[model samples]
Target: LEPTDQDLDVLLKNLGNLVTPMALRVAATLRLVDHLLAGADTLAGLADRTDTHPQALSRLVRHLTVVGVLEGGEKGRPLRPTRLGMLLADGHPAQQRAWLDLNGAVSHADLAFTGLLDVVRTGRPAYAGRYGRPFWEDLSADVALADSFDALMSCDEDLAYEAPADAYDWSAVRHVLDVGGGNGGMLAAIALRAPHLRGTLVELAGPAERARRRFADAGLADRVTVAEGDFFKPLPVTADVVLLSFVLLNWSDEDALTILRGCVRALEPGGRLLVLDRADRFFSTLLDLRMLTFMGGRVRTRDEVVDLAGSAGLALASERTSGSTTLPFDFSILEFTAVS
Candidate 1:
């Protein structure tokens, strides 16, 4: 199976083929698979449902068929998704559609790579410079994009217990406060695992509402509450354990310190602040650059977390690292206690 010279050349060319990837993303963006599954399987039907030019969409579909993502649709026949293409379905466990949807936040953020040249030249994030606003501000301005972001952060049943629920010792913790908790998934997991613990989540307007509905749907409303708030500001609520899961990676060092300080302030005396964040590994290094391209942030090492937390008036209590077989990044939860 060794690649010959000709094979290597073709492989290199395929690796750099922008059209196929963009076509796939365009199909995901337009929800073409969803449309086809919903019975809009013909060229005209897809164009009508997607509101795109029929001829252009036909060419795109032809390419997708050639690439083996889509099969059929020739000579007025219906279209069908290949097994590979089904990964883009809305309900796919991989959630590839959300990441591939160009109209959404993360996929659009992935476009920041076009400005990676300037990023390397100036050593600054590409998002603000390319988009003319900070990434968070852009999302705040676009409700749809923000909604997409919140949905992507939501966890499935398998990932629930794998996350913060099992990342710490919640036996003694009476109440859990999750800062920047998107859709309250972590809290929901904690509620499912430790029924004795009450939980609260701090989120913005959109996600706060979603978290409320999610809690209600899970019949966990009585066990949890959602507060509309920002993490940069000192939280008005206190808890026995304050969880900051996947938060600091989205902020600069200064802002991260500010958030750490705020979490510490929200902690009762000797209360623990759990920083469940990205691990400093090879894959996480790639994500660190992704964070840079999306927002001017970074993935910090345990030493960095401890140093920042210590500076923010917290003492390192304990730490553990965990990862799911389904995930790409290993998660580290650093437990810090109030000191200052």
Candidate 2:
């Protein structure tokens, strides 16, 4: 079962695959696919449209053509999308272009990972080390970048559409409170699922306002209340079901405990608090690396989560894998109940 020489060669060859991301980043950074779709199919035309050096663009295009993302750039022929290339076109259902840009050359997120050396060296988030500001502060200061981040987060349809409706039982719940809920997507899905239950969303001012509009668009505005406030402090409303989804990973252990304590305060006696997160080793390690590189935070183990909730005066009632089939991550749902 050990690797053979040929297997090792393949491993080393795959190790050199960073070039694929580099090439894709260059092409995405230049918006070459968009320009090609917009009628600027020639290398010179793409360079002119993107305001880049023509020769450099030509070389980038040739490299991309050779890599099979593009075709027919020789002899001044117009560039066209190969089958693989069409996936990178803007507005494609795959959203491949958005992902490429979000994690590649032009994005602040991609640039953050470039400082992994500093993260490993200092045991701190590389974004702050490189950008001289925290990740949240950088996003708050730049409107466009914040919008891009929100857009990328919102595109994870499974996080909203299937998880909420399938993850837990809603029969006994009268109201649901989503703490640190951004854009209110999960709440919208829950509201649609449980017509008798009211919903509340707590978020910052900007995302709260956006969530209001989203709730309205989803026809749940009447049933959902959007409360704008800091989740680190007391939550704005109490409910029978308190949900924290992908929120605690953004802060340190103390802050996560603070948020959990706030949730405890806002829960009625015997109320259920649901903590949904990636708790397995591989995903947790990957998320920890991302936290080290992007946010000054760390992922928690199930034991850590249980301890945190216990400290917040809640008892761990149950734990199980989420019923959601669409989500890519293996989510563990830690159910806690308010102590009498």
Candidate 3:
């Protein structure tokens, strides 16, 4: 009745799946990486600086050191960062450590996945099943958690699709509206590339304010207007180019159609609707499953997107692939125009 070595190997790997994430989360939660960078090189020094028991900190450090995140110790030398550890260094522009902390141990979003069985039975997000509310509603209820999620969204340095700012010819377009654009990162990139185009961002109040401050900090305040509102409601502005950048994936088919209709309503004659998001691929499919588990959202295929546009009185004008290799998944763009 004993399992073979291969079977045991698979079981062992599956059993240890949470170990790495847990260890990394612990280090990030305790600010261990930053402390080490600040001369808390020894285990005892890190414990003292972080206000943790020395024995517990020592064991944690040993695990991290074995995992190639921290350097091994010498009698006289303190611990040092490995190449991987540098990515999580405090105040590092990348700040991937923030994402690890948000989705790892002690975070509600992480704990929500523990209700996966309930999700499967009810066909609803495990998040809602666990917390008694939808994921977005949960975020709205907690300001700090919502802000951290926003930071995680913007911390991604890679664009979801390539040439987002330059993929289409902007010479003739006078105005661009980024619907559901978070933190105005894409709008900023586009503004930098197309200085002649004026940009408007429509997002929630918190992100709208954050986008405004970010635009001001980036010296783009004059060229971009931050409009705080919900996209599901009627939009108040008109633009030659309206961007639904990675927005549709966060909604169901009906909800996605509603957002698309809003885009159609705001589009003038001969205006373009640009849908930028991840393509149908392995990574995108995995994210789709995560959405099913966490937010009741789903990623659509090209044909499905076309169907949504058609339902909203828009026609697929053109399609192109963005040559992006750096993103977590491949992305493609669909251009739509108002149907006459």
Most TM-score-accurate candidate = 2
Model 1, position 54, has a per-residue lDDT of: 94
Angstrom error of the Cα, residue 135, model 1: value is 4.1
- TM-scores for every candidate against the unseen true structure: 0.74, 0.76, 0.72
Please provide, for model 2 over 1-340, each residue's C-alpha lDDT reduced to its tens digit, 9 standing for 90 to 100: 9889988866655554666677787676667787788887766677788899998777777778877999986785678888888887878886668667744312556567777777778666778767777776676556666676766653355454566457677867899999988777677877877888899998776677778998898888888999978787888889989999788877777778888989999998878999877657775676577776787577778898899889889899998875455655567788999776
Of candidates 3 and 2, the better by TM-score: 2
Per-residue alpha-carbon lDDT of candidate 1 for residues 1-340, written as tens digits (9 for 90 to 100): 8779988777755866767778989999999998888877778878999899999998999999988899997785679899989998999988998888998888888888788888778667888877888787677667898878766754434364455567666678798888988677677777877878888999877677878998998788897989988788879689888998777988878888998888888888768888877745775666768887788689789999899889988889898888766555677888888776
Total backbone collisions for each predicted model: 0, 0, 0
Candidate that scores best on lDDT = 1
> What C-alpha lDDT does candidate 2 achieve relative to the native structure?
0.76
Task: Locate the minimum summed-lDDT window of 10 residues in model 3.
Answer: 153-162
Off by over 4 Å in 3: 1-5, 12-20, 33-48, 52-97, 102-108, 128-162, 189-198, 217-223, 279-286, 324-330
In Å, residue 210's CA in model 2 sits off its true spot by 1.7
Alpha-carbon deviation at 56 in model 3, angstroms = 6.4
